[PDB]
């Protein structure tokens, strides 16, 4: 009856739209299921411009590839929102949504109405949240031990690159925090670390720096590259005027005023430079090994470069907006706009400042600080995609170690949490039901659908997932009567079980909590949508 409204309008009702939601989610899952696990496949994104991007994360894949199917758009927007807050779980949510639909679609053909199916999802999900509190283990972060942070950070890097580069990047992402902590304030910000993209050495030769690194080099040759003692002066004012707000001009009566009107603009430039030179010599005069460095956010007049060249002052222009807040944390100084107010107290301190020339550009390196409140990570690569592949591995590793400090509870990984929910959701007894036979249908579909995560890991390794999970159920049966608590994981090497706590594999709290809740809403709305309609004016 839709064509009577519009001739070009189309629709698919009841099972016509139901087959779309099950197939489109299964087709999208089949592509992204091969990326789950350390043995997962590597996708190469090639656009019309010829750019090559190698990443195993579903956030970049779904962003570069436009999805025509409307059903998979909900999964892409759900996996995108999962990467925003938790920085992880893109592939996990995609694999859960498609599995919740296929398991529930089998009961629909048996005569089960989708309404009671959605009831079994919400009741079983609330019981999983209660089990999540008992299954998680609280940790003490006051000791700041390295061994605990290395194993958690390595687990996220094993899903990106091989084990050779993982061992190199593991202490880097572990050192990504270090001196940044607060006991009372609880505020933790990962935007203070800088991601540098440059081609130098090899991707495995990168190292961590304890201080800020800038991409701007010395504008004048006489500016000393290496400075033992430097006082960073933050200047947000532009020394070179781009334009005057009020329109004005210079009208000279005689040619003698031409050089005078040109010197009139020299007074305002020298007025800002007069207080800067007096600030350097204010501390101590004729003092070797002590330099003075200015980092400016706006442009610097090339004419004024010779003013600082005689005093051996390093100047940097066109700094990033996020760089101003980082100068206070690293150098310990204070952000200043104009030069009207200066003092040695607001100046920063650095133990080593040097610059290196890579290609046609020069980069500024600042390190050796007393109590630096921020740091940076230098990402080097041998090609174009090496900068994008390592960056996606670090950014996904930053959010992993952040949840450890934000939440002291750590949940073991390697599919140990999904297997534990299988036996718990089989029989709920009289605890939570709400109906006779109506609710138990949706709970059974949600319980067997959580086993796709451990089975997908085995399929990427080339083994039999049914044989791996067979020995898992046999161990959990004997562990209950032996009065011993054991966490059974999945090992992809020999095709046997393992212990995630001993093997060093753990998962974040916010990633697993938002994955179950996020995938439940996506799969529920698709089961509750019986019609797919398209209408509008072209």
């Amino acid at each position: 009856s839709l064509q009577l409204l519009n001739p070009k309008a189309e629709s698919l009702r009841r099972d016509a739209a139901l087959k779309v939601n099950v197939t489109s989610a299964e087709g999208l899952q089949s592509v992204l299921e091969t990326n789950l696990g350390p043995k997962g496949t590597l996708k190469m994104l090639v656009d019309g411009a010829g750019n090559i991007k190698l990443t195993k994360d579903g956030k970049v894949l779904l962003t570069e590839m436009q999805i025509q199917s409307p059903t998979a758009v909900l999964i892409a927007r759900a996996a995108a929102a999962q990467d925003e807050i938790t920085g992880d779980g893109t592939t996990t949510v995609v694999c859960l949504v498609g599995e919740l639909l296929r398991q529930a679609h089998r009961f629909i053909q048996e005569g089960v109405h989708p309404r009671i199916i959605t009831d079994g999802f919400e009741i079983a999900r609330k019981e999983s949240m209660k089990f999540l509190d008992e299954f998680k283990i609280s940790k003490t972060n006051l000791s700041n031990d390295r061994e605990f942070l290395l194993q958690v950070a390595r687990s996220s890097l094993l899903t990106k690159v091989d084990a050779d580069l993982t061992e190199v990047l593991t202490p880097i992402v572990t050192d990504a925090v270090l001196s940044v902590y607060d006991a009372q304030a609880d505020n933790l910000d990962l935007h203070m670390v800088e991601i540098m993209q440059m081609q130098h050495l090899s991707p495995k030769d990168t190292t961590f720096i304890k201080g800020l690194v800038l991409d701007h080099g010395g504008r004048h040759p006489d500016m000393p590259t290496r400075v033992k003692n430097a006082y960073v002066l933050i200047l947000n004012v532009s020394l070179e005027y781009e334009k005057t707000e009020v329109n004005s001009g210079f009208f000279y009566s005689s040619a003698d005023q031409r050089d005078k009107l040109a010197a009139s603009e020299r007074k305002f430039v020298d007025a800002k430079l007069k207080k800067i030179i007096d600030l350097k010599n204010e501390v101590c005069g004729m003092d070797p090994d002590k330099g003075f460095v200015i980092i400016n956010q706006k442009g610097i007049d090339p004419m004024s470069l010779d003013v600082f060249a005689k005093h051996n002052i390093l100047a940097l222009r066109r700094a990033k907006r996020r760089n101003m807040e980082r100068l206070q944390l690293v150098t310990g100084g204070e952000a200043q706009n104009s030069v009207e107010d200066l003092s040695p107290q607001i100046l920063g301190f650095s133990g080593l400042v040097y610059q290196e020339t890579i290609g046609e550009e020069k980069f500024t390196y600042v390190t050796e600080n007393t109590d630096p409140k921020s740091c940076t990570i230098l990402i080097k690569g041998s090609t174009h995609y090496a900068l994008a592949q390592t960056k996606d591995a670090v950014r996904d590793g930053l959010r992993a170690v952040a949840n450890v400090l934000k939440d002291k509870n750590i949940i073991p990984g390697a599919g140990a949490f999904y297997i534990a929910l299988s036996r718990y959701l089989r029989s709920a007894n009289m605890n939570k039901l709400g109906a006779k036979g109506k609710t138990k249908t949706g709970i059974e579909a949600f319980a067997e659908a959580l086993l796709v995560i451990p089975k997908t890991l085995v399929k990427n390794s080339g083994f039999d997932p049914l044989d791996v999970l067979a020995m898992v159920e046999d161990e959990l049966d004997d562990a209950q009567d032996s009065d011993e608590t054991r966490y059974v994981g999945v090992d992809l090497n020999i095709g046997d079980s393992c212990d995630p706590t001993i093997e060093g594999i753990w998962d974040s709290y916010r990633v697993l909590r938002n994955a179950i809740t996020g995938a439940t809403g996506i799969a529920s709305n698709l089961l509750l949508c019986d019609e797919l309609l398209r209408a509008g004016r072209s």
């Binding site: 009856s1 189309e10 009841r14 087959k19 758009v73 797919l532 398209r534």
Partner: protein, 548 residues
């Protein structure tokens, strides 16, 4: 998001195949598709019904109000409409009467079914509702019958049968059209009363000849068949009377030719000189035996050579050409002759009798008069139909066939079994089925009560086409049926019916004086076909079409 999945895995069938099911309001669209062609036949119902013009692809125009004839030239698309189209064609062939009733009744059963489906009644329960109500409907038709035809032929009694049937088709003048058809029926009846023989009648015996020009009042009834023919040798008024002896030959008149390689063989000039005079003596010897028997007319079924037509003009023998077959077959039934293929002398017992053969101008061309007289009665009489327009001549020919088909209804059953006309048949069934719906417990009473509501279309159609308000006239008619039956017998209130124009307010007293009645044998098959036509549409949950 930009483009739909466009029904994935639809490649199982060709792109021209479409699936339509009772769900998604398509069963309502099928009922709504009936109303498009239903209103076309509503204005054509009754004596005030309006004829329709339908132009085919060849340019032929047939103007008729008959639902069975109109649906022939129309191209039908929707599949369930073809169920309604083919249902009206069967009623025209079988009983030759009640074609517009099957079209209207089967269409109203689907209209009242739209409310039945909306209330949640399954297709199975709706079918059982009409089947149980139809069996009770056929039983009440035999209880409400009044009067009988009794004797086969009567001057007055034939005005209560053919006349009310032809009143709806080209109403015009009443007694003019009724006398022309009723006269031709009395000629084809074998009569022979008290003999105990089984009566017989043929619907193809009476033939209608369409002749343009003149007026309807100038039409007459001819006991013989009328064709357009030009006599070859000469024309004869045959005033010498003493009737005639006529013979019919289905084979042409000519020298018998070998079916394989007919060839003239002449060895010498002696055989060539006698070859020209030899063929002349063959036809002379064959035609002499026919002329000696007193045969003044010979009917030929194919082309006759010129050498054979020469000796036929010598003895003054007429020549008739009867092409094809059926035209020649009905000629022998008039004179009672038996054709024989040979050219020899016919048997005197197989010769026919025709008193006069005349050739006069009627519509501008020469027609031959086979008309019979009082004695030596003949069968398969023809009716000369004069009209100004050829379009009126086509439907009146079918209007006469409706009266001829009504005569067939006087043979197979025990009698005529006249029913009250003017829509009084379908109105009385409303009060009887309403009481029948209450006597049946359960949920099946919903389809039974609505089955009687579909009978309200007959009084509403006759009132709407008459230029009267259906809201004022129809409830005033139930006042006669709302008083049920009194404490005394002899209740004449069953004769109340719907009146056209005039003073309105019901009227025409009892229809017994009006003499318009209906046939019981027609209403039996009219309800059965119309019910199965609507049942078939409701019994189809899914419809599949090809190429469109």
């Amino acid at each position: 998001s930009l483009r739909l999945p466009q029904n994935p895995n639809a490649g199982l069938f060709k792109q021209g195949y479409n699936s339509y099911s009772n769900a998604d309001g398509q069963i309502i669209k099928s009922i709504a598709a009936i109303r498009e062609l239903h209103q076309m036949c509503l204005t054509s119902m009754g004596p005030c019904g309006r004829n329709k013009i339908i132009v085919n692809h060849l340019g032929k125009i047939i103007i008729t109000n008959d639902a069975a004839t109109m649906l022939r030239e129309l191209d039908i698309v929707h599949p369930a409409v073809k169920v309604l189209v083919m249902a009206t064609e069967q009623q025209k062939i079988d009983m030759g009467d009640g074609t517009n009733l099957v079209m209207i009744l089967a269409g109203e059963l689907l209209n009242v079914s739209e409310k039945l489906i909306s209330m949640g009644l399954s297709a199975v329960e709706i079918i059982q509702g009409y089947n149980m109500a139809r069996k009770f409907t056929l039983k009440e038709l035999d209880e409400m019958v009044v009067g009988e035809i009794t004797d086969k032929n009567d001057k007055n009694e034939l005005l209560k049968m053919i006349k009310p049937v032809i009143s709806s088709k080209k109403y015009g003048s009443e007694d003019i059209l009724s006398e022309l058809v009723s006269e031709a029926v009395s000629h084809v009846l074998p009569v022979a009363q008290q003999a105990g023989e089984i009566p017989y009648f043929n619907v193809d015996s009476i033939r209608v000849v369409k002749i343009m020009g003149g007026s309807l009042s100038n039409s007459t009834v001819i006991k013989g068949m009328v064709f357009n023919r030009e006599p070859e040798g000469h024309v004869k008024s045959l005033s010498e009377d003493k009737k005639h002896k006529v013979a019919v030959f289905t084979c042409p008149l000519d020298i018998a030719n070998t079916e394989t390689k007919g060839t003239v063989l002449l060895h010498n000039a002696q055989e060539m000189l006698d070859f020209s005079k030899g063929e002349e003596k063959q036809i002379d010897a064959m035609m002499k035996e026919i002329a000696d028997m007193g045969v003044e007319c010979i009917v030929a079924g194919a082309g006759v050579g010129e050498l054979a037509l020469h000796y036929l003009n010598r003895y003054g023998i007429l020549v008739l050409k009867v092409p094809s077959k059926f035209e020649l077959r009905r000629l022998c039934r008039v004179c009672g002759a038996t054709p024989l293929p040979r050219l020899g002398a016919p048997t005197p017992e197989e010769l026919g009798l025709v008193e006069t053969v005349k050739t006069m101008e009627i519509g501008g061309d020469r027609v031959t008069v086979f008309k019979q007289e009082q004695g030596e009665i003949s069968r398969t009489s023809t009716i000369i139909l004069r009209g100004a327009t050829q379009n009126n001549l086509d439907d009146i020919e079918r209007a006469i066939d409706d009266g001829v088909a009504a005569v067939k209804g006087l043979m197979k059953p025990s009698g005529g079994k006249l029913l009250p006309g003017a829509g009084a048949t379908e109105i009385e069934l409303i009060s009887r089925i309403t009481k029948y719906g209450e006597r049946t417990p359960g949920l099946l009473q919903l389809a039974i009560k609505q089955f009687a509501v579909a009978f309200e279309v007959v009084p509403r159609t006759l009132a709407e086409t008459a230029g009267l308000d259906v809201n004022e006239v129809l409830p005033n008619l139930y006042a006669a049926h709302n008083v049920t039956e009194p404490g005394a017998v002899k209740t004449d209130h069953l004769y109340k019916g719907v009146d056209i124009d005039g003073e309105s307010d019901e009227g025409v007293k009892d229809i017994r004086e009006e003499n318009i009645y209906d046939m019981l044998a027609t209403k039996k098959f009219a309800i059965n076909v119309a019910t199965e036509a609507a049942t078939t549409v409701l019994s189809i949950d899914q419809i599949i079409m090809a190429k469109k």
